[PDB]
Design a protein around this motif. Structure first.
Motif, PDB file in Angstrom:
ATOM      1  N   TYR A 112      -4.399   4.300   1.209  1.00  0.00           N
ATOM      2  CA  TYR A 112      -3.728   3.872   2.445  1.00  0.00           C
ATOM      3  C   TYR A 112      -4.460   4.404   3.696  1.00  0.00           C
ATOM      4  CZ  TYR A 112       0.539   2.271   4.888  1.00  0.00           C
ATOM      5  OH  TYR A 112       1.456   1.588   5.662  1.00  0.00           O
TER       6      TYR A 112
ATOM      7  N   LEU B  85      -3.476   7.181  -4.140  1.00  0.00           N
ATOM      8  CA  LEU B  85      -2.771   6.026  -3.563  1.00  0.00           C
ATOM      9  C   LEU B  85      -2.607   6.183  -2.042  1.00  0.00           C
ATOM     10  CD1 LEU B  85      -1.366   3.381  -4.510  1.00  0.00           C
ATOM     11  CD2 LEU B  85       0.785   4.659  -4.202  1.00  0.00           C
TER      12      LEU B  85
ATOM     13  N   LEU C   1      -2.553  -2.651   1.463  1.00  0.00           N
ATOM     14  CA  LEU C   1      -2.145  -3.167   0.164  1.00  0.00           C
ATOM     15  C   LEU C   1      -3.358  -3.391  -0.711  1.00  0.00           C
ATOM     16  CD1 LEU C   1       0.895  -5.240   1.306  1.00  0.00           C
ATOM     17  CD2 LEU C   1       0.716  -3.297  -0.269  1.00  0.00           C
TER      18      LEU C   1
ATOM     19  N   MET D  55       6.650  -1.020  -3.191  1.00  0.00           N
ATOM     20  CA  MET D  55       5.879  -0.378  -2.153  1.00  0.00           C
ATOM     21  C   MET D  55       5.742  -1.262  -0.940  1.00  0.00           C
ATOM     22  SD  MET D  55       2.798   1.765  -3.874  1.00  0.00           S
ATOM     23  CE  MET D  55       2.068   0.335  -4.677  1.00  0.00           C
ATOM     24  N   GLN D  56       5.555  -2.553  -1.177  1.00  0.00           N
ATOM     25  CA  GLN D  56       5.489  -3.517  -0.100  1.00  0.00           C
ATOM     26  C   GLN D  56       6.740  -3.480   0.738  1.00  0.00           C
ATOM     27  OE1 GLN D  56       3.277  -7.301  -1.197  1.00  0.00           O
ATOM     28  NE2 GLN D  56       5.303  -8.068  -0.624  1.00  0.00           N
TER      29      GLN D  56
ATOM     30  N   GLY E 291       2.964   7.306  -7.986  1.00  0.00           N
ATOM     31  CA  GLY E 291       1.726   6.908  -7.337  1.00  0.00           C
ATOM     32  C   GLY E 291       0.634   7.915  -7.552  1.00  0.00           C
ATOM     33  N   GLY E 292       0.774   8.762  -8.568  1.00  0.00           N
ATOM     34  CA  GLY E 292      -0.330   9.675  -8.871  1.00  0.00           C
ATOM     35  C   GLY E 292      -0.038  11.179  -8.774  1.00  0.00           C
TER      36      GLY E 292
ATOM     37  N   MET F 201      -4.908  -0.115  -1.827  1.00  0.00           N
ATOM     38  CA  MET F 201      -4.054   0.481  -2.847  1.00  0.00           C
ATOM     39  C   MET F 201      -4.115  -0.248  -4.185  1.00  0.00           C
ATOM     40  SD  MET F 201      -0.770   1.983  -0.958  1.00  0.00           S
ATOM     41  CE  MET F 201      -0.376   0.364  -0.251  1.00  0.00           C
ATOM     42  N   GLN F 202      -4.180  -1.576  -4.150  1.00  0.00           N
ATOM     43  CA  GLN F 202      -4.346  -2.355  -5.396  1.00  0.00           C
ATOM     44  C   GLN F 202      -5.607  -1.904  -6.100  1.00  0.00           C
ATOM     45  OE1 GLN F 202      -3.698  -6.551  -5.597  1.00  0.00           O
ATOM     46  NE2 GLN F 202      -2.687  -6.595  -3.586  1.00  0.00           N
TER      47      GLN F 202
ATOM     48  N   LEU G 208       3.897  -2.527  -6.812  1.00  0.00           N
ATOM     49  CA  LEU G 208       3.373  -3.134  -5.599  1.00  0.00           C
ATOM     50  C   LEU G 208       4.465  -3.809  -4.775  1.00  0.00           C
ATOM     51  CD1 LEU G 208       0.568  -3.139  -4.470  1.00  0.00           C
ATOM     52  CD2 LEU G 208       0.579  -5.651  -4.801  1.00  0.00           C
TER      53      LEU G 208
ATOM     54  N   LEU H  93       6.431   5.983   0.190  1.00  0.00           N
ATOM     55  CA  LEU H  93       5.512   5.107  -0.534  1.00  0.00           C
ATOM     56  C   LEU H  93       5.418   5.511  -2.007  1.00  0.00           C
ATOM     57  CD1 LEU H  93       3.611   2.651  -0.181  1.00  0.00           C
ATOM     58  CD2 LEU H  93       1.743   4.430  -0.378  1.00  0.00           C
ATOM     59  N   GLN H  94       5.189   6.803  -2.269  1.00  0.00           N
ATOM     60  CA  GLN H  94       5.183   7.311  -3.635  1.00  0.00           C
ATOM     61  C   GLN H  94       6.509   7.161  -4.351  1.00  0.00           C
ATOM     62  OE1 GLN H  94       3.379  10.980  -1.877  1.00  0.00           O
ATOM     63  NE2 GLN H  94       2.874  11.263  -4.053  1.00  0.00           N
TER      64      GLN H  94
ATOM     65  N   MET I  77       6.889  -0.362   2.873  1.00  0.00           N
ATOM     66  CA  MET I  77       6.039  -0.574   4.039  1.00  0.00           C
ATOM     67  C   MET I  77       6.738  -1.511   5.019  1.00  0.00           C
ATOM     68  SD  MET I  77       2.269  -1.232   2.486  1.00  0.00           S
ATOM     69  CE  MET I  77       2.952  -1.298   0.866  1.00  0.00           C
TER      70      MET I  77
END
Ligand SMILES: Cc1ncc(COP(=O)(O)O)c(/C=N/[C@@H]2[C@H](O)[C@@H](O)[C@@H](OP(=O)(O)OP(=O)(O)OC[C@H]3O[C@@H](n4cc(C)c(=O)[nH]c4=O)C[C@@H]3O)O[C@@H]2C)c1O
Ligand SMILES: Cc1ncc(COP(=O)(O)O)c(/C=N/[C@@H]2[C@H](O)[C@@H](O)[C@@H](OP(=O)(O)OP(=O)(O)OC[C@H]3O[C@@H](n4cc(C)c(=O)[nH]c4=O)C[C@@H]3O)O[C@@H]2C)c1O
Lengths: 370, 370
Positions: free
Chosen positions: B236, B232, B15, A18-19, A187-188, B18-19, A15, A232-233, A22
């Motif tokens: 977003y 994810l 955020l 990723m923050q 992220g998946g 996504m959390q 997080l 992001l990922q 962003m």
């Protein structure tokens, strides 16, 4: 409710990175975190060029594209692998030639490969099953002998090595997955193309960016696709690579608990445990067992479901599938592939699996076997 | 330092969503937020099936795949578009047939399409430039008369409509981008395939899932790819779709500021502003202006750079590009495509662009034009 077969790795730092991504105002592919991840992967594993993609499937498709696969070209791979391994090349018009597995590792049997080679063969794609390396020295030799490219499907093999070498880096092209089911996730979804053959790097970069020379007026210069993961990922992935060793060490500990607990049942012949050839170092992507047959396996699955524990089988042999009889051909006898696929069972194994829950899985298992 | 041409939309809630996605233990494609986004898009825009993909490029490729493009098939599209609109079909062996744009909208000239049709033609793919619709009633009539598929490249068109219809929902297949440069982004990269021809939905779902069936044993049933965005990214995007109207309204206001400020220079013949045909509702994806020629445009670009303001040109016509001369053919005379592409300049425009910075941009512009 249930103890799951898998849960995506969560380190606790994703997080924040990723923050940060962003905050930077760049989220599309090939941003700062994409680049840092590629650098991390290049230096740690020793590959000339690593390129992050939306999935291992995309990386595999990209390899086929890079190698200029033409209709009629033959690509040798196991039938015991994920659909994408075949689709990536079929998409280019390839004919798939399937080769039986060695049952100890469920990897392509390196000794059955040469016999399947023809004047049409152009690529072999070993699959490092459960992060256990294929017998690569042999396979690379065969390929030098017959002028073949080697594309590694090292989807499960991030952090695994073969004779000291990082998986995905021993072939002209390597492919990683960062899917939620893998040891490391972006992220998946996600993948990486490893361009180990330096001669292919120029074009790899061009087709990754939709066939333009965007990394450099940019213009349409070749075929390509959008083989970019979001930044992001990559920020998510970067958080996980920062914990690469912590994750790996924990997964290996969990793997060894399974091995230690089930070893007596194996010495009695009730089951078989995975084999790890000399010189291969695994990454604990998977802990599988072999039951006697599909009925034995189905009974255990049901016993575990009763116990709110999720265990799972894996690949259905591609060659026996509809599309498989159509797009491919099994060379030689299906001696192990179908049989072994029907007795293989995968146990809950993931980074965030609690010690108490693994003990529960194990106690339930020892209960089924008496 | 610089006022940028673009910054990815940030709503402020991404955020939290996504959390939630991370908290759910599901991050791979086709999780909860993927399903919700698809529901939102289907119901708001009126499409039978929407499927989230890693990129609009991926959606265009999937479209080519769905329509079973064969080598030799001809696909008609503007030369004034992004490489992917072409690459997606060339990947399938299509020959690309380019048609000139109409200069007022820079869209494919719907009156020039029929002259380019042959017995080999199978698809026309109109591109909704700047989120301003192509003349779709005419194009669809044309396509029905000649049994052609229409694939909308509606990458720039989320929230735009044509005669009340959401762009992307008109042709048999539509394609969106959720790339960082667009009005709505899925964490930096993303797309959606809109399957409006209900007959194509079954196969669409299979191709999307690596050529397997997700009635959930599953098996290899067709060609396909990994056309999943991570959940994810979908989280977003879901956050951004919750603010769909707010974002759209803010972009429209900024757009109108530019139009109002630059209108007098346009009435004086110094520049041209965008045209929006009757019945077309745009989404303020872009505010472009047309200079007298490429030298005028370069001078303005350099003047703005001096002012620490980033303004930018756009597509280099595909037919004139290296790959375009090889994979495609421009039908008829290039009357507008190259000329107009060379005088078009796009101004800073994004959701989080402050009014004070926009005023600075406008002031610098009015300064350049005297
Ligand atoms: C060599 C190789 N190459 C390429 C790639 C692609 O990488 P990318 O995705 O990044 O593009 C992969 C990765 N594949 C993994 C998993 O290994 C794969 O199993 C499957 O996982 P799932 O999301 O489905 O969930 P699950 O818990 O693993 O199983 C759930 C149930 O599905 C049943 N099942 C499963 C299979 C496989 C099959 O054939 N037939 C079948 O009936 C077993 C269960 O009950 O998909 C993942 C991406 C790979 O290994
Ligand atoms: C109809 C259509 N179909 C498909 C898709 C794909 O979808 P997905 O990505 O979702 O998969 C798109 C998306 N296109 C967008 C942008 O519209 C496009 O501009 C470009 O933007 P960038 O990331 O590069 O940044 P930028 O600021 O827009 O420009 C940067 C500089 O590059 C110079 N330039 C630009 C172009 C275009 C070109 O050919 N040649 C060239 O020299 C102009 C600048 O100075 O790429 C984006 C993905 C599309 O519009």
């Amino acid at each position: 409710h249930m103890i799951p077969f898998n849960a995506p790795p969560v380190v606790g730092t994703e997080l924040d990175y990723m923050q940060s991504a962003m905050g930077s105002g760049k989220l599309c592919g090939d941003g700062g975190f994409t680049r840092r991840c590629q650098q991390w992967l290049e230096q740690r594993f020793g590959s000339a060029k690593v390129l992050l993609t939306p999935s291992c499937t995309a990386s595999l498709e990209m390899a086929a594209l890079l190698l200029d696969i033409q209709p009629g070209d033959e690509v040798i791979m196991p039938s015991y692998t994920f659909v994408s391994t075949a689709n990536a090349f079929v998409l280019r018009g390839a004919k798939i030639v399937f080769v039986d597995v060695r049952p100890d590792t469920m990897n392509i049997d390196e000794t059955l490969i040469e016999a399947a080679i023809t004047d049409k063969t152009r690529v072999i794609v070993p699959v490092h099953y459960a992060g256990v390396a294929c017998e690569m020295d042999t396979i690379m030799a065969l390929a030098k002998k017959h002028n073949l490219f080697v594309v590694e499907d090292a989807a499960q093999g991030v952090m695994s090595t073969y004779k000291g070498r990082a998986l995905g880096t021993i072939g002209h092209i390597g492919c990683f997955s960062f899917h939620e089911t893998k040891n490391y996730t972006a992220g998946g979804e996600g993948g990486a193309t490893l361009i180990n053959d330096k001669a292919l790097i120029e074009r790899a970069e061009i087709i990754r960016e939709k066939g333009t020379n965007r990394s450099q007026k940019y213009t349409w210069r070749d075929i390509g696709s959008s083989y970019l993961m979001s930044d992001l990922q990559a920020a998510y992935l970067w958080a996980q690579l920062e914990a690469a060793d912590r994750i790996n060490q924990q997964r290996l500990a969990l793997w060894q608990n399974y091995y230690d607990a089930l070893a007596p049942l194996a010495k009695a012949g009730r089951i078989e445990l995975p084999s790890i050839p000399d010189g291969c170092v695994q990454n604990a992507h998977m802990f599988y067992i072999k039951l006697r047959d599909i009925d034995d396996r189905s009974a255990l699955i049901n016993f575990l479901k009763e116990a709110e524990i999720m265990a799972v089988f894996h690949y259905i042999p591609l060659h026996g599938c509809p599309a498989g009889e159509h797009f491919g051909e099994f060379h030689g006898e299906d001696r192990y592939t179908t049989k072994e696929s029907e007795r293989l069972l995968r146990l809950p194994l993931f980074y965030n699996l609690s010690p108490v829950n693994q003990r529960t899985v194990i106690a339930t298992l020892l209960n089924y076997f008496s």
